Amino acid sequence: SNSQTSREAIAKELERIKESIVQLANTSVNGQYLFAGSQVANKPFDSNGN
Amino acid sequence: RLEYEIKTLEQVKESTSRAQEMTQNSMKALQDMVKLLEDFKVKVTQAASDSNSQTSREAIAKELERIKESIVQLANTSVNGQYLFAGSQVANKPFDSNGNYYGDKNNINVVTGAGTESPYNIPGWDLFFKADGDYKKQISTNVSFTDNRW
Amino acid sequence: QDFEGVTKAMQDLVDAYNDLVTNLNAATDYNSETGTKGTLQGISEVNSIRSSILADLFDSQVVDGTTEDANGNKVNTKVMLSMQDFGLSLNDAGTLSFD
Amino acid sequence: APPFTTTSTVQNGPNFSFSANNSLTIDEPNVDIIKDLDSMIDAVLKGNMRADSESENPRNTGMQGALERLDHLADHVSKLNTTMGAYHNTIEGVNTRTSF
Amino acid sequence: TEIKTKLLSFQTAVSSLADATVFAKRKVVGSISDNPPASLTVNSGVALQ
Amino acid sequence: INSKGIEGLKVKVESYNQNNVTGFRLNFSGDGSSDFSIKGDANILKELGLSDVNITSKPIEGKGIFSKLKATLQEMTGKDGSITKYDESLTNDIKSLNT
């Protein structure tokens, strides 16, 4: 029933939810990237999943 | 180090707090404008009638005229001179009564993350002049035609 | 024919319209006493539906008319019009009143 | 130049144009809010649900096109609500994220 | 939920707005109260005679 | 044909003298409700100056906005409804907080 951008109206938050996952993975817990493997000093991702 | 973490975390919480309130008032204001749009077309809806006199056309249109300029008033609003729709450049009375713009096209932002930014602010130009992909451009003739067989 | 039975219901329905209008207003609107976005106020689910369905509600027709305004054919014409014009008066308060 | 048929012949046109006795469009993605309202009042005052080339305003079929134009523009407002509301949920989470 | 009930409440109201039931129907008129002449039975579509 | 009582239809016969040819030609009308569709021995139809032919049903709308509005509210109130979607989430949102 939505127009296409009307569907993208819902995309508004999905962008952030996607982005929210992105930032939550990158977290430098205590400045230490638990998610960067053994190298927790390295910021694990580009924020695009690489 | 752990205290600095909390010490810094507190700065974010207040920072997030002060923007969150502006959002609710910002969301509030936007729909308030929408209502005037809603009230605009309702009066237009009955205006479509045909038996009406010229002053009747005035009679409705005049209220709509004030809604026009009134919306221009509310569009130019600032909180403490922070004009709610001047893009990344909000210190400016953004609009005029002909719809021309007096802010910029970018978006103010404030940083919240392990090196992350958060942009929120509306550029009034794009608000007044951006385009949508759902839509297309309509086009028609102005000369009009008839059976002149008499 | 005896239209009237529903005719009364329609206006009673108009009343049952206004109550929902009030319910939207009472429920959906702000909470400024705490300068607060009311619980349901400002919700995307709320604002989208409220405006859209009301817009859905207003949809109109084309009709003929005796005329000194509008598109015109002569001092008679064809016109784009809807329910309120012949039927029922629409308030700045949103509600509907009967004529 | 002739000869033609009762079918098209083809020729090339100019490289550029800047103003012309062009055709009419009264709805297009790029918004022009106030001037749209300005043209609308023009049609409203006269009672123009239709314009003609010869009309004093040779082009402004304001009232009918306005309905289309307004709805198109109203949609632009709607999705902005979605972006704007999306802000608060996002930042609200950040404060929540920060708080815990 | 409570307001949705109001929506639900008026939805049935809208449901009637979609209908055209009574407006098909018919009724008769007469001029005797007792010791009766005759009775006619009518419903929708009968002539407005 | 007119004897069968084909509902809303009767048939008239009409002549032809054109292009120095003499002929007899046929016509009929209908209310457009359904397709008019035919079975006949094509061979006799040819001798009749005929062939099995059809023009389709073709209604016209009333634009039942109150029905369409009713449909709009059916989906929104039904399990399909987005407001119904978020109603479900509040349960989930409460569930997650409890968990």
Side-chain angles (χ1 to χ4, degrees):
Chain A
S1 69
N2 294 140
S3 80
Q4 192 40 279
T5 310
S6 292
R7 294 182 261 289
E8 310 327 307
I10 307 104
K12 268 61 197 166
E13 192 36 79
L14 291 163
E15 293 179 353
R16 283 76 177 274
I17 304 157
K18 157 179 56 51
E19 190 277 331
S20 297
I21 297 169
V22 171
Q23 295 298 289
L24 294 174
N26 280 314
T27 304
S28 66
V29 179
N30 205 316
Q32 289 145 332
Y33 299 98
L34 320 186
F35 294 96
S38 64
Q39 301 301 259
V40 306
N42 188 359
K43 187 157 187 175
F45 295 88
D46 52 348
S47 299
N48 296 115
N50 297 295
Chain B
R1 185 184 58 240
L2 287 65
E3 281 76 70
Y4 208 90
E5 179 62 26
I6 291 153
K7 165 174 160 175
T8 48
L9 283 164
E10 294 294 328
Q11 300 145 19
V12 175
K13 272 132 86 177
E14 59 81 18
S15 302
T16 46
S17 304
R18 62 157 168 278
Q20 281 158 265
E21 59 85 19
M22 185 63 72
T23 60
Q24 67 167 354
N25 292 317
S26 298
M27 280 91 71
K28 169 56 163 52
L30 193 156
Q31 273 297 317
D32 303 326
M33 291 334 307
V34 169
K35 298 160 199 169
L36 294 174
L37 314 181
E38 293 167 344
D39 211 42
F40 210 79
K41 215 170 190 178
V42 161
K43 313 330 160 184
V44 167
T45 292
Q46 43 261 29
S49 311
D50 74 302
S51 313
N52 290 318
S53 76
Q54 187 58 35
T55 184
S56 311
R57 300 189 264 296
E58 307 171 45
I60 295 89
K62 279 173 298 215
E63 293 82 3
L64 282 296
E65 189 278 331
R66 279 84 60 85
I67 296 161
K68 284 180 64 169
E69 59 85 18
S70 292
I71 292 166
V72 175
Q73 309 164 19
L74 294 174
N76 269 312
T77 297
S78 47
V79 294
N80 298 315
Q82 295 176 356
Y83 294 83
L84 309 184
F85 319 103
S88 71
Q89 193 257 350
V90 175
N92 297 107
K93 182 279 296 186
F95 311 121
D96 62 28
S97 304
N98 178 238
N100 318 291
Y101 178 60
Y102 303 88
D104 68 350
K105 300 211 197 187
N106 288 269
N107 176 349
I108 296 170
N109 61 7
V110 64
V111 289
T112 58
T116 307
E117 179 52 273
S118 306
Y120 63 89
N121 189 71
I122 297 169
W125 191 97
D126 311 71
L127 183 63
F128 290 180
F129 313 108
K130 183 54 67 67
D132 183 337
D134 286 333
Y135 293 87
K136 317 169 68 52
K137 299 201 184 201
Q138 166 281 337
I139 176 173
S140 178
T141 75
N142 62 353
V143 188
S144 297
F145 295 96
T146 296
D147 191 12
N148 298 113
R149 276 185 311 144
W150 309 264
Chain C
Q1 184 280 317
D2 303 69
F3 53 99
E4 264 300 285
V6 168
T7 306
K8 317 327 301 169
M10 294 298 102
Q11 180 48 46
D12 313 327
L13 187 153
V14 170
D15 291 331
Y17 181 76
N18 296 330
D19 69 0
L20 176 52
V21 168
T22 58
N23 278 289
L24 294 159
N25 293 318
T28 69
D29 303 350
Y30 210 71
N31 182 18
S32 181
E33 54 91 25
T34 46
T36 284
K37 164 212 161 303
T39 60
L40 303 188
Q41 201 270 324
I43 302 304
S44 59
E45 188 68 21
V46 171
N47 64 6
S48 55
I49 293 172
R50 194 178 191 184
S51 298
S52 60
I53 197 67
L54 294 174
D56 188 358
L57 183 63
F58 308 147
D59 170 35
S60 313
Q61 297 273 22
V62 162
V63 293
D64 297 334
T66 47
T67 322
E68 296 301 330
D69 203 336
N71 210 29
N73 165 44
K74 329 282 175 205
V75 296
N76 64 7
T77 189
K78 289 194 176 292
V79 177
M80 187 66 204
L81 298 178
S82 180
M83 295 299 291
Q84 72 180 358
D85 309 328
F86 48 89
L88 183 63
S89 63
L90 179 55
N91 312 142
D92 63 358
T95 46
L96 294 174
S97 66
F98 197 31
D99 44 357
Chain D
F4 318 140
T5 58
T6 56
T7 55
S8 186
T9 64
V10 176
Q11 169 191 68
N12 166 246
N15 274 317
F16 308 96
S17 168
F18 296 95
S19 298
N21 215 18
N22 59 11
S23 50
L24 177 143
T25 284
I26 51 174
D27 204 1
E28 55 93 14
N30 296 115
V31 182
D32 210 322
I33 305 181
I34 296 299
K35 291 167 208 63
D36 296 331
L37 294 174
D38 291 331
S39 311
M40 288 161 189
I41 301 299
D42 188 358
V44 172
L45 294 174
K46 53 195 64 163
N48 170 328
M49 292 165 118
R50 264 271 171 270
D52 177 75
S53 51
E54 304 297 327
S55 66
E56 70 283 17
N57 184 323
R59 274 271 280 261
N60 182 16
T61 297
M63 284 197 291
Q64 291 288 354
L67 294 174
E68 183 178 1
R69 175 62 167 175
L70 294 174
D71 301 331
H72 176 185
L73 294 174
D75 186 12
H76 296 167
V77 184
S78 177
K79 290 134 180 181
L80 292 161
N81 290 264
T82 61
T83 64
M84 184 66 213
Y87 291 164
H88 187 193
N89 321 306
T90 312
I91 190 167
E92 183 178 1
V94 179
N95 206 341
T96 304
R97 174 173 177 174
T98 317
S99 65
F100 181 76
Chain E
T1 299
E2 54 81 19
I3 190 165
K4 283 153 43 146
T5 310
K6 322 286 173 311
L7 281 70
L8 286 155
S9 305
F10 199 72
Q11 170 45 17
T12 60
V14 175
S15 307
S16 49
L17 294 174
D19 81 8
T21 75
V22 307
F23 304 105
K25 306 188 178 185
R26 296 293 189 269
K27 186 203 77 214
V28 177
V29 184
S31 49
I32 284 189
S33 299
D34 197 8
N35 274 286
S39 60
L40 178 69
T41 60
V42 308
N43 294 116
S44 308
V46 177
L48 278 296
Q49 62 80 13
Chain F
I1 297 169
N2 314 336
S3 84
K4 300 307 310 215
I6 296 143
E7 294 294 328
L9 183 143
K10 286 187 177 179
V11 181
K12 57 191 177 92
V13 178
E14 55 181 0
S15 298
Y16 176 97
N17 188 359
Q18 183 179 2
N19 304 329
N20 300 339
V21 160
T22 50
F24 316 124
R25 64 182 293 275
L26 286 76
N27 185 264
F28 73 81
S29 299
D31 67 357
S33 48
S34 76
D35 298 16
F36 69 82
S37 290
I38 289 153
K39 192 273 153 184
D41 179 353
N43 307 277
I44 192 66
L45 303 201
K46 297 325 302 154
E47 186 160 63
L48 294 174
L50 294 174
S51 311
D52 297 330
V53 60
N54 176 344
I55 296 176
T56 69
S57 176
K58 177 61 192 72
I60 315 166
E61 293 293 328
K63 192 259 293 177
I65 183 66
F66 311 152
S67 312
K68 304 142 181 43
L69 178 43
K70 190 197 176 265
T72 308
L73 315 173
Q74 282 153 218
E75 190 282 340
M76 192 36 58
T77 55
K79 61 186 181 292
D80 291 331
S82 66
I83 187 62
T84 303
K85 296 289 99 175
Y86 182 76
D87 213 315
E88 301 145 30
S89 65
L90 283 158
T91 80
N92 312 332
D93 315 318
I94 290 163
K95 290 167 209 167
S96 46
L97 287 166
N98 284 315
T99 305

Coordinates of all heavy atoms in Angstrom, one line a residue, chain E residues 5-28:
Chain E
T5 N -10.0 1.4 20.4 CA -11.4 1.0 20.6 C -12.3 2.0 20.0 O -13.3 1.7 19.3 CB -11.7 0.7 22.0 OG1 -10.7 -0.1 22.6 CG2 -13.1 0.1 22.2
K6 N -12.0 3.3 20.2 CA -12.8 4.4 19.6 C -12.7 4.3 18.1 O -13.7 4.4 17.4 CB -12.3 5.8 20.1 CG -11.8 5.8 21.5 CD -13.0 5.9 22.5 CE -12.6 5.8 23.9 NZ -11.6 4.7 24.2
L7 N -11.5 4.0 17.6 CA -11.4 3.8 16.1 C -12.2 2.6 15.7 O -13.0 2.6 14.8 CB -9.9 3.5 15.8 CG -9.0 4.7 15.6 CD1 -8.7 5.4 17.0 CD2 -7.7 4.3 15.0
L8 N -12.1 1.5 16.5 CA -12.9 0.3 16.2 C -14.4 0.6 16.3 O -15.2 0.2 15.5 CB -12.6 -0.8 17.2 CG -11.2 -1.5 17.0 CD1 -10.7 -2.1 18.3 CD2 -11.4 -2.6 15.9
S9 N -14.7 1.4 17.3 CA -16.1 1.8 17.5 C -16.6 2.6 16.2 O -17.7 2.2 15.7 CB -16.3 2.8 18.7 OG -15.7 2.1 19.8
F10 N -15.9 3.6 15.7 CA -16.3 4.3 14.6 C -16.1 3.5 13.3 O -16.8 3.8 12.3 CB -15.7 5.7 14.5 CG -16.4 6.6 13.6 CD1 -17.6 7.2 14.0 CD2 -15.9 6.9 12.4 CE1 -18.2 8.1 13.2 CE2 -16.6 7.8 11.6 CZ -17.7 8.4 12.0
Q11 N -15.2 2.6 13.3 CA -15.1 1.7 12.1 C -16.4 1.1 11.7 O -16.7 1.1 10.5 CB -14.0 0.7 12.3 CG -13.9 -0.4 11.3 CD -13.9 0.1 9.9 OE1 -13.7 1.3 9.6 NE2 -14.2 -0.7 8.9
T12 N -17.1 0.5 12.6 CA -18.4 0.0 12.3 C -19.3 1.2 11.8 O -20.1 1.0 10.9 CB -19.1 -0.6 13.6 OG1 -19.1 0.4 14.6 CG2 -18.2 -1.7 14.1
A13 N -19.1 2.4 12.4 CA -19.8 3.5 11.8 C -19.5 3.8 10.4 O -20.4 3.9 9.5 CB -19.5 4.8 12.7
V14 N -18.2 3.7 10.1 CA -17.8 3.8 8.7 C -18.4 2.7 7.9 O -18.7 2.8 6.7 CB -16.3 3.8 8.5 CG1 -15.8 3.8 7.1 CG2 -15.7 5.1 9.2
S15 N -18.4 1.5 8.5 CA -19.0 0.3 7.8 C -20.4 0.6 7.3 O -20.8 0.3 6.2 CB -19.0 -0.9 8.7 OG -17.7 -1.1 9.3
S16 N -21.2 1.3 8.1 CA -22.5 1.7 7.7 C -22.4 2.7 6.5 O -23.2 2.6 5.5 CB -23.3 2.3 8.8 OG -22.5 3.3 9.5
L17 N -21.5 3.6 6.6 CA -21.4 4.6 5.5 C -21.1 3.9 4.1 O -21.4 4.5 3.1 CB -20.2 5.6 5.8 CG -20.5 6.5 7.0 CD1 -19.3 7.3 7.3 CD2 -21.7 7.4 6.8
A18 N -20.5 2.7 4.2 CA -20.3 2.0 2.9 C -21.6 1.4 2.4 O -21.7 1.0 1.2 CB -19.3 0.9 3.2
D19 N -22.6 1.2 3.3 CA -23.8 0.4 3.0 C -24.9 1.4 2.4 O -24.8 2.6 2.4 CB -24.4 -0.3 4.2 CG -25.2 0.6 5.1 OD1 -25.5 1.8 4.8 OD2 -25.5 0.1 6.2
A20 N -25.9 0.7 1.7 CA -27.0 1.4 1.2 C -28.3 0.7 1.5 O -29.2 0.5 0.6 CB -26.9 1.6 -0.3
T21 N -28.5 0.2 2.7 CA -29.5 -0.8 3.0 C -30.9 -0.2 3.1 O -31.8 -0.5 2.2 CB -29.2 -1.5 4.3 OG1 -29.5 -0.7 5.4 CG2 -27.7 -1.9 4.3
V22 N -31.2 0.6 4.0 CA -32.5 1.2 4.2 C -33.0 1.9 3.0 O -34.2 2.0 2.7 CB -32.6 2.0 5.5 CG1 -32.1 1.3 6.7 CG2 -31.9 3.4 5.3
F23 N -32.0 2.5 2.3 CA -32.4 3.5 1.2 C -33.0 2.8 0.0 O -33.5 3.4 -0.9 CB -31.1 4.3 0.9 CG -30.5 5.0 2.1 CD1 -29.4 4.5 2.7 CD2 -31.2 6.1 2.6 CE1 -28.9 5.2 3.8 CE2 -30.7 6.7 3.7 CZ -29.5 6.3 4.3
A24 N -32.9 1.4 0.0 CA -33.6 0.7 -1.0 C -35.1 0.5 -0.6 O -36.0 0.4 -1.5 CB -33.0 -0.7 -1.2
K25 N -35.4 0.6 0.7 CA -36.6 0.0 1.3 C -37.8 1.0 1.0 O -37.7 2.1 0.4 CB -36.5 -0.2 2.8 CG -35.3 -1.1 3.1 CD -35.2 -1.5 4.5 CE -34.0 -2.4 4.7 NZ -34.0 -3.0 6.1
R26 N -39.0 0.5 1.3 CA -40.3 1.2 1.0 C -41.2 1.1 2.2 O -41.0 0.4 3.2 CB -41.0 0.5 -0.2 CG -40.2 0.6 -1.5 CD -40.1 2.1 -2.0 NE -39.5 2.1 -3.3 CZ -38.2 2.3 -3.6 NH1 -37.3 2.3 -2.6 NH2 -37.9 2.3 -4.9
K27 N -42.2 2.0 2.2 CA -43.3 2.0 3.2 C -44.6 2.5 2.5 O -44.5 3.2 1.5 CB -42.9 2.9 4.4 CG -43.9 2.9 5.5 CD -43.8 4.1 6.4 CE -44.4 5.3 5.7 NZ -43.8 6.6 6.0
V28 N -45.7 2.1 3.1 CA -47.0 2.5 2.6 C -47.7 3.5 3.5 O -47.2 3.7 4.6 CB -47.9 1.2 2.5 CG1 -49.3 1.5 2.0 CG2 -47.3 0.2 1.6

